[PDB]
Amino acid sequence: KNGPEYASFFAVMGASAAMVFSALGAAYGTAKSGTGIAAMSVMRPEMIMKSIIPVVMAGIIAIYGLVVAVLIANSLNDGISLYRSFLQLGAGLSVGLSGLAAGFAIGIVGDAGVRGTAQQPRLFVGMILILIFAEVLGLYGLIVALILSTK
Amino acid sequence: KNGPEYASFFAVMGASAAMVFSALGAAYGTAKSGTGIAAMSVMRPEMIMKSIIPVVMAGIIAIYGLVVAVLIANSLNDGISLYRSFLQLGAGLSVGLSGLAAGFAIGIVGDAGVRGTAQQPRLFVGMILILIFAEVLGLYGLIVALILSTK
Amino acid sequence: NGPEYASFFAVMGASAAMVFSALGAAYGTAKSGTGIAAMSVMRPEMIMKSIIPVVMAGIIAIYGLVVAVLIANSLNDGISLYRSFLQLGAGLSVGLSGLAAGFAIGIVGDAGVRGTAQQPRLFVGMILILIFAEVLGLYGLIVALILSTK
Amino acid sequence: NGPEYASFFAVMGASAAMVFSALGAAYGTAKSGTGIAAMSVMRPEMIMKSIIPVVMAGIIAIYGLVVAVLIANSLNDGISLYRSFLQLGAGLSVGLSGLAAGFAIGIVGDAGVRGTAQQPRLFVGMILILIFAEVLGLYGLIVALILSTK
Amino acid sequence: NGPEYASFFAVMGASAAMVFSALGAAYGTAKSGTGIAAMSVMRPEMIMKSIIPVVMAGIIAIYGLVVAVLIANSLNDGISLYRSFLQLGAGLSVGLSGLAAGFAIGIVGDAGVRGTAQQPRLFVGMILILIFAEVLGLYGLIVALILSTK
Amino acid sequence: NGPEYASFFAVMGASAAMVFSALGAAYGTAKSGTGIAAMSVMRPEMIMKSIIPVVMAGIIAIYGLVVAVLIANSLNDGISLYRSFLQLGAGLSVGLSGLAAGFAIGIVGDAGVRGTAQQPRLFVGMILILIFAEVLGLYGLIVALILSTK
Amino acid sequence: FPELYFNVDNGYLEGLVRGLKAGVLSQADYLNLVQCETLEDLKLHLQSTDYGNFLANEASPLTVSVIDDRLKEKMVVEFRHMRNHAYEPLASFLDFITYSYMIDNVILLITGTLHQRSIAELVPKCHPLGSFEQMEAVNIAQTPAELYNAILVDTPLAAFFQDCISEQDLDEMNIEIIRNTLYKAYLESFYKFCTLLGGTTADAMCPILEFEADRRAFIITINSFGTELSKEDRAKLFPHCGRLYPEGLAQLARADDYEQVKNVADYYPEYKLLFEGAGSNPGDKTLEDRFFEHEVKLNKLAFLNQFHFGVFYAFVKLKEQECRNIVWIAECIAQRHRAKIDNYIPIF
Amino acid sequence: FEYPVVFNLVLWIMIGLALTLIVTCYNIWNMDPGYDS
Amino acid sequence: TGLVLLYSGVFVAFWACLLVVGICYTIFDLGFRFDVAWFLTETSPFMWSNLGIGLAISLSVVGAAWGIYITGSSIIGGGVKAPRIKTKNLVSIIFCEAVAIYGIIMAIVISNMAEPFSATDPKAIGHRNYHAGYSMFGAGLTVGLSNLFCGVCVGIVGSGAALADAQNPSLFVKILIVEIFGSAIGLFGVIVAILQTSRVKMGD
Amino acid sequence: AGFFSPGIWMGLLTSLFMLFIFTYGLHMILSLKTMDRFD
Ligand SMILES: CO/C1=C/C(C)=C\[C@@H](C)[C@@H](O)[C@H](C)C/C(C)=C/C=C/[C@H](OC)[C@@H]([C@@H](C)[C@@H](O)[C@H](C)[C@@]2(O)C[C@@H](O)[C@H](C)[C@@H](C(C)C)O2)OC1=O
Ligand SMILES: CO/C1=C\C(C)=C/[C@@H](C)[C@@H](O)[C@H](C)C/C(C)=C/C=C/[C@H](OC)[C@@H]([C@@H](C)[C@@H](O)[C@H](C)[C@@]2(O)C[C@@H](O)[C@H](C)[C@@H](C(C)C)O2)OC1=O
Ligand SMILES: CO/C1=C\C(C)=C/[C@@H](C)[C@@H](O)[C@H](C)C/C(C)=C\C=C\[C@H](OC)[C@@H]([C@@H](C)[C@@H](O)[C@H](C)[C@@]2(O)C[C@@H](O)[C@H](C)[C@@H](C(C)C)O2)OC1=O
Ligand SMILES: CO/C1=C\C(C)=C\[C@@H](C)[C@@H](O)[C@H](C)C/C(C)=C/C=C/[C@H](OC)[C@@H]([C@@H](C)[C@@H](O)[C@H](C)[C@@]2(O)C[C@@H](O)[C@H](C)[C@@H](C(C)C)O2)OC1=O
Ligand SMILES: CO/C1=C\C(C)=C\[C@@H](C)[C@@H](O)[C@H](C)C/C(C)=C/C=C\[C@H](OC)[C@@H]([C@@H](C)[C@@H](O)[C@H](C)[C@@]2(O)C[C@@H](O)[C@H](C)[C@@H](C(C)C)O2)OC1=O
Ligand SMILES: CCCCCCCC/C=C\CCCCCCCC(=O)O
């Protein structure tokens, strides 16, 4: 039943990568689409609070990685089998690299969106409907990490 | 019961990498957003002490890594098990590289935010709202480093 | 039969025959499809006659699927190490030559449909160069059918 | 007889004779294919006689096709390690020199049909440089036919 | 006789002599072939006289051929490791010095031919510098002959 | 005698003495030879006066040839490991020091012949700098003769 | 390879400048403008385009000097919007477009200095694209072009002034030799910057910058016949950028006749068939009216590529033709001389 | 007996402290302070 | 190039060091120390199995999000002047959204086939659990990379079709054919991925 | 002894794989440069 002594390396490397790679995607979507707030603030200052959605939707990317990295850190156990620990490395890469790339697309569309909404306000329902499709991508990595970590 | 001789390498790396990569993020937040204070100073010098908010937000990133570099270095013994030191390797990476990302997001928004506040004073309530979202990325890495260091 | 690790090279011959020929079919459709969507605003009549550089890049996609189905059905538990090296070399030979035949369709098909929008005399010359770039993926297929079916 | 992994180098000569000569025939077709579409907007008469730099790039591909059939038809299970190294170097010789010949046909076939558009007197001079850049694929063929047939 | 891995270092001398001299002969033909098309548009009389820097680059192609046939005809099943290393350094020494001679021919042949379009007295001086870049491939030939024949 | 792998390091001293002095002589005749073409348009008189950086770059090539013949004639089947380490360091000492000297000749010989186009007083000063870049290959020669003839 | 990136930083701005292509007037937009009979009715037929309600506040007597000044202040606020949203690989490219107007304003700022004038020529008499509202030491430099040339090196035109010493513009060189030696150093520095940016923006833009070096190779050597500048004085005015560089510029500096520049353009079959202006006929297009049809033919071809920076320079040079075409329609309507009203360039 | 441990402890540190050293000395070598005045 | 010099400085120094090491294992007969058999058999098949599930979904949504931001900057960038784009040109977004549907389907089809065993000997772990380990790695690689290439292919065409709809509104239904041929590349990776794990059973 | 043990080869193929993921996610955040002017 007792696995090798290095078996718990790959599960903590999945709990680390579920939080590290999600925080990198959430910091790109906050910094890129928060630079776009200051460019539209000078001419159209009434659309500031309405355009904080691309830094809110990039913040849900980080709580996708926090949920997985807590479930891996609670399913950790001294002497886990080598099968169970690689299940949580693949659960860390499934929500880590998902939130890295889904948080990239919230940054690029969110920076291009809040600058094109401040000139054409009809694009606000069109910007948020592309950001939704770039936010379910972070949820496809979440609900396939909930399968792998709880397998 | 006892761990091998090389087992203490991975836990003193997570003590250093919690302090190295969180100070590398807190320095990017201080440098990139401290370049923006000198740009807003040449035209609007009343908002100097009020614009130290993006560099006091990066100062909390540095003490997120200081706490868990104390929580790890006070949990060190000679001959700790290889599982107990792998826990404190991912507890150092998930708060160093989360505070590294959260320091890249503080320094970019803090640069564009205090340069847009010089030309639009209504952005200061919006910039301080984005910096809350970019500061909890280091906090989500803290509450997953505490849940890993303690066990 | 063969050793325990023997099925690693036949799996990487079914992967690389489809991955490397998807990159050729994706470049041949995106580089030339950039040229279709930009010539179409000035010439909206030849927009359908110029699709044929993207259906020729799609043949590169089905050149790699013919061998990736042929390898992944003949592969069994414990083949010989000789038969798995054959299907690895049959996977790289159609994948990496479909990647070259997908590059030379993208660069020719982009420049061809811009020179056809400026002058319609190039269309018979464009679909003649595009055969020379598309038989490069056929030469990789008829030597991946030789190697895999030994 | 030889080891079981002896057939690894023998199928890396059937692969590298085809993938490196298709990557040379792609650069001869693509890079010189933009030169046709850039000169045919002004000179539409010289289209069918400018297919010569992409015809000569297509012979570089069938140089590697011949060697990759000679190697793959001389394959058995348990061949010796000496005959396996010959066919590896027979794939790298016709492959990496056909890639060099395809690099040179692509450069002087693109720039040749630009100068042929500005002057019809360069058409005999461009062909002679295309002969010198196509015997480089022929020199790699006669070392691949010497090494593989020992 | 020598070990079983010994024939790998002799085929990689027959292959590295061919593919590195072809890469030098391609760069001498490609870079000094675009110098012909930029020269001829004003002075088209000196087109056939300007085939010399692609002729001198074509002799570097056969400096590597005459030792790729010389190494591949001294190959035997079970050559010694000392005999097999002599042919490795006979391929690396006419290749990488012929690649240098083709690198220097393509630079001074391109700049020289562009220089004789506006000054015809440079052509007897450009052809003298091409001799000096030619013998760099000849110095690698006569040291690859005293290594293979040992 | 010595081990069976001992002759590898002496062959890589015979070839590194050639291919690194031929790369120095390539950069010497190509970088200075592209300055002869820019000088020729305004001063076509001193064309033969300007082959001196190209001549002294060819002296670097025969410095590496002399050591490479001297190493390749000091080879036996089964030399000691000490003797073959001497000729590895005798090949780097004239190869990589001829690559430095040939780089220096090509840089000052390029600016020297473009400076004598506008002032012929530099010509007696251009040659005097090139002797200082010549002796770096000569210093590498007389340490290669000391190391190899032990 | 430049296509899977380039929408990171420059994806919103490229779709914006292609939205401003759709506002460039078509042939059917021009055919409704040539039917106008007064400038008051040209205000009506322009409102059906995207120009609309731009002349609605000026005056009831509508003169042609207001339409020209209100058209070109609409291209400035469209260019200044795309520069204030630009990132650094593109903002360095958009500053290279304004150096053709900073050069035309620096020369205007030294003629007042040699004739002892001041900032009164700066604000009303300069192009707003290349504008000096920052670098405020230029705006107070009343010094006679010696302590002022030491202020023009605190300006992005500093790297082009390495062939004009401050003693040369101090009445030593003619005012057009100072122009074209800066413009020679401008195009050769803009051709190298457009070669470092490789890929699609180096083959859709360097054909435009090659023809711009061959316009000023042909137009300089044709207008340098009766004047007193030597053949060595116009050989340093040729930009070493175009197709004519090693051979045509050797013959253009020895021409001395219009028939000697016609048989050096016969070597290049793109420049012959452009040398058929042939102004001996009374009514036809001249040479520079045929060089403008080729400047906008290469500029339309930049919109056939997608992922490149050349879509922005080919919009400024096609919105400049809008301020030349509509004013030409307005200057043939206000004078009622509309038999040559079809001598515009029908861009789209 | 611990030869694979001590080999990988030295190798992945001394090229982790060399790449950190090379990147640092590359940025101070190419500093670009800005110098005309 | 500043940072590409670092990536090319490591890639050169890796393969130049494998050139020297490769001609020092053969040359003093230490070939026997290489042991690619020992690498493929002593590395756990749960490592290859979970680099197949980890790369089926994550490398699909890399290409699903790479194709969204390429064409989503052309919706909002091109739709400032012509705001009729934002409802007709959403099927370009869906065609690169569906390549992540193929990722999450083929990540939970592969994950149903991985089951634990207890053996540790490479003879006790037979060549059914090793074939099941390699085929899960090679099926998450041919459905992750073939959707990484398909998702950017229908994003580059979708970004060009969103800028042709801005000029002429009648052109979008004909450049939609090019996104159909581009989105068939992603379905071709799923056909190979279900055939690599058809006869796969892991466990004992 | 050898240079590598089978526990290191699994831990090195995992660490040097998500180092490639990290430097892909750090190269993008090292290139999100801001603007110079505002309007
Ligand atoms: C001396 O104290 C400082 C302390 C340091 C080094 C470290 C920790 C305390 C800090 O790392 C902790 C983590 C965060 C915190 C709570 C800091 C308080 C900081 C000081 O206080 C804000 C400001 C001080 C400049 C600041 O106080 C201004 C005087 C100001 O008063 C101006 C206000 O208009 C401004 C809005 C307000 C905000 C910024 C707090 O503070 O500096 C300092 O060096
Ligand atoms: C057609 O086969 C030619 C070369 C081929 C196929 C293959 C190789 C074997 C070549 O690898 C080898 C080296 C043979 C070679 C290089 C021979 C010289 C040949 C001819 O001899 C110039 C010219 C030929 C171009 C000639 O017709 C030139 C017009 C010209 O003669 C015109 C002369 O004015 C100019 C002065 C002259 C010089 C060099 C004496 O070149 O090549 C060829 O025929
Ligand atoms: C104060 O920090 C806020 C939350 C923080 C600190 C912490 C974590 C849980 C958070 O880190 C995570 C990201 C919580 C999360 C994933 C969303 C929470 C969103 C809030 O709930 C919209 C908004 C939002 C209410 C508010 O910020 C704006 C006022 C605004 O509501 C104004 C609206 O007019 C605009 C339309 C609206 C958007 C959201 C619909 O944004 O902020 C906050 O309170
Ligand atoms: C379209 O694929 C065609 C044939 C294919 C696939 C050949 C491969 C097997 C090729 O792998 C290799 C190169 C063999 C080869 C040699 C083919 C020549 C082919 C044709 O040539 C007859 C071309 C066609 C270029 C040619 O026929 C032109 C009409 C032309 O005849 C026009 C002439 O004015 C021109 C001078 C003449 C010269 C250039 C050959 O070519 O047609 C074709 O059907
Ligand atoms: C056969 O190839 C020639 C030399 C080659 C290949 C030498 C190799 C064997 C080499 O290993 C070296 C370089 C032998 C060597 C060192 C020759 C030196 C000069 C040659 O002379 C002997 C010049 C020289 C005659 C001539 O080329 C020049 C026109 C000139 O005569 C005219 C003078 O104005 C000029 C100043 C003077 C200088 C340059 C020496 O030489 O030519 C050649 O043909
Ligand atoms: C065993 C430890 C070895 C690994 C440690 C690696 C940690 C790297 C830490 C810092 C490297 C960053 C230095 C580059 C400074 C960036 C300059 C800039 O971007 O302006």
Short mmCIF file of N, CA and C in Angstrom, two decimals, chain A residues 37-38 41-42 45 48-49 52, chain B residues 37 40 44 46-57 109-110 112-132:
data_model
loop_
_atom_site.label_atom_id
_atom_site.label_comp_id
_atom_site.label_asym_id
_atom_site.label_seq_id
_atom_site.Cartn_x
_atom_site.Cartn_y
_atom_site.Cartn_z
N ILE A 37 -8.28 50.36 -19.11
CA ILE A 37 -9.18 51.24 -18.38
C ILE A 37 -8.65 52.66 -18.36
N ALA A 38 -7.34 52.81 -18.18
CA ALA A 38 -6.75 54.14 -18.08
C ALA A 38 -6.67 54.85 -19.42
N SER A 41 -10.30 56.17 -19.81
CA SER A 41 -10.76 56.99 -18.69
C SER A 41 -10.62 58.47 -18.97
N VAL A 42 -9.70 58.85 -19.85
CA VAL A 42 -9.38 60.26 -20.03
C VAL A 42 -10.49 60.97 -20.80
N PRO A 45 -15.01 59.14 -18.93
CA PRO A 45 -14.83 58.75 -17.52
C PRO A 45 -16.07 58.18 -16.84
N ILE A 48 -16.17 53.86 -16.30
CA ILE A 48 -15.09 53.21 -15.56
C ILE A 48 -15.60 51.97 -14.85
N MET A 49 -16.61 52.14 -13.99
CA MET A 49 -17.13 51.03 -13.20
C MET A 49 -17.87 50.00 -14.04
N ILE A 52 -15.22 47.32 -15.53
CA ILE A 52 -14.37 46.54 -14.63
C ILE A 52 -14.70 45.06 -14.73
N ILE B 37 4.92 57.70 -10.75
CA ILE B 37 4.74 58.82 -9.82
C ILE B 37 5.58 60.01 -10.27
N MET B 40 3.56 61.79 -13.11
CA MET B 40 2.44 62.61 -12.66
C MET B 40 2.88 63.76 -11.77
N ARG B 44 1.01 67.49 -11.72
CA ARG B 44 0.00 67.44 -10.66
C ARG B 44 0.68 66.99 -9.38
N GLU B 46 0.01 67.67 -6.19
CA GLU B 46 -0.76 67.44 -4.98
C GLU B 46 -1.03 65.95 -4.76
N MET B 47 -1.20 65.20 -5.85
CA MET B 47 -1.38 63.75 -5.77
C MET B 47 -0.03 63.05 -5.86
N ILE B 48 0.73 63.15 -4.77
CA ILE B 48 1.96 62.39 -4.62
C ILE B 48 1.77 61.40 -3.49
N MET B 49 1.39 61.90 -2.31
CA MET B 49 1.18 61.03 -1.17
C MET B 49 -0.08 60.18 -1.31
N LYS B 50 -1.04 60.61 -2.13
CA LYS B 50 -2.22 59.81 -2.38
C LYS B 50 -1.97 58.73 -3.43
N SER B 51 -0.88 58.84 -4.19
CA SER B 51 -0.55 57.87 -5.23
C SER B 51 0.51 56.88 -4.79
N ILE B 52 0.75 56.75 -3.48
CA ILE B 52 1.70 55.80 -2.92
C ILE B 52 0.91 54.51 -2.65
N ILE B 53 -0.39 54.56 -2.94
CA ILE B 53 -1.23 53.37 -2.83
C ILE B 53 -0.80 52.21 -3.73
N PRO B 54 -0.41 52.40 -5.01
CA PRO B 54 0.12 51.25 -5.76
C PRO B 54 1.48 50.73 -5.31
N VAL B 55 2.20 51.43 -4.43
CA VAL B 55 3.44 50.86 -3.89
C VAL B 55 3.29 50.41 -2.44
N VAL B 56 2.19 50.76 -1.77
CA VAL B 56 1.87 50.08 -0.52
C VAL B 56 1.07 48.81 -0.78
N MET B 57 0.48 48.67 -1.97
CA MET B 57 -0.15 47.42 -2.35
C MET B 57 0.89 46.37 -2.71
N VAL B 109 -0.75 48.08 -13.69
CA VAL B 109 -1.94 48.88 -13.38
C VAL B 109 -1.55 50.11 -12.56
N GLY B 110 -0.60 49.96 -11.65
CA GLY B 110 -0.12 51.10 -10.89
C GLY B 110 0.66 52.11 -11.70
N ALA B 112 -0.10 52.71 -15.22
CA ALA B 112 -1.10 53.37 -16.04
C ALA B 112 -2.15 54.07 -15.19
N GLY B 113 -2.36 53.60 -13.96
CA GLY B 113 -3.40 54.19 -13.12
C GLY B 113 -3.02 55.56 -12.58
N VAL B 114 -1.77 55.73 -12.16
CA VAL B 114 -1.34 57.02 -11.62
C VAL B 114 -0.93 58.00 -12.70
N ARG B 115 -0.78 57.55 -13.94
CA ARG B 115 -0.58 58.47 -15.04
C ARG B 115 -1.90 58.91 -15.65
N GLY B 116 -2.93 58.07 -15.56
CA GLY B 116 -4.27 58.49 -15.93
C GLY B 116 -4.98 59.29 -14.87
N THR B 117 -4.54 59.20 -13.61
CA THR B 117 -5.11 60.04 -12.56
C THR B 117 -4.61 61.47 -12.68
N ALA B 118 -3.44 61.67 -13.30
CA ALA B 118 -2.93 63.01 -13.53
C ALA B 118 -3.75 63.77 -14.56
N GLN B 119 -4.41 63.06 -15.47
CA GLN B 119 -5.24 63.69 -16.49
C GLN B 119 -6.73 63.44 -16.28
N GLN B 120 -7.10 62.63 -15.30
CA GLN B 120 -8.51 62.34 -15.01
C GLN B 120 -8.59 61.94 -13.55
N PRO B 121 -9.00 62.85 -12.66
CA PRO B 121 -9.07 62.51 -11.23
C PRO B 121 -10.17 61.53 -10.86
N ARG B 122 -11.09 61.21 -11.77
CA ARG B 122 -12.13 60.24 -11.48
C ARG B 122 -11.66 58.80 -11.65
N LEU B 123 -10.41 58.58 -12.06
CA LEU B 123 -9.88 57.24 -12.23
C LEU B 123 -9.34 56.66 -10.93
N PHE B 124 -9.10 57.51 -9.92
CA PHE B 124 -8.48 57.07 -8.68
C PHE B 124 -9.36 56.11 -7.90
N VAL B 125 -10.68 56.23 -8.02
CA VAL B 125 -11.56 55.26 -7.39
C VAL B 125 -11.59 53.98 -8.21
N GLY B 126 -11.26 54.06 -9.50
CA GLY B 126 -11.22 52.87 -10.33
C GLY B 126 -9.89 52.14 -10.28
N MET B 127 -8.79 52.89 -10.18
CA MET B 127 -7.47 52.26 -10.09
C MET B 127 -7.31 51.51 -8.78
N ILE B 128 -7.79 52.09 -7.68
CA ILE B 128 -7.74 51.43 -6.39
C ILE B 128 -8.71 50.25 -6.30
N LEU B 129 -9.64 50.13 -7.24
CA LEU B 129 -10.51 48.97 -7.32
C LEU B 129 -9.89 47.83 -8.11
N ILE B 130 -9.07 48.15 -9.11
CA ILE B 130 -8.35 47.11 -9.84
C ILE B 130 -7.22 46.55 -9.00
N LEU B 131 -6.56 47.41 -8.21
CA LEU B 131 -5.45 46.96 -7.37
C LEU B 131 -5.90 46.07 -6.22
N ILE B 132 -7.18 46.07 -5.87
CA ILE B 132 -7.69 45.06 -4.95
C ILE B 132 -7.72 43.70 -5.63
#
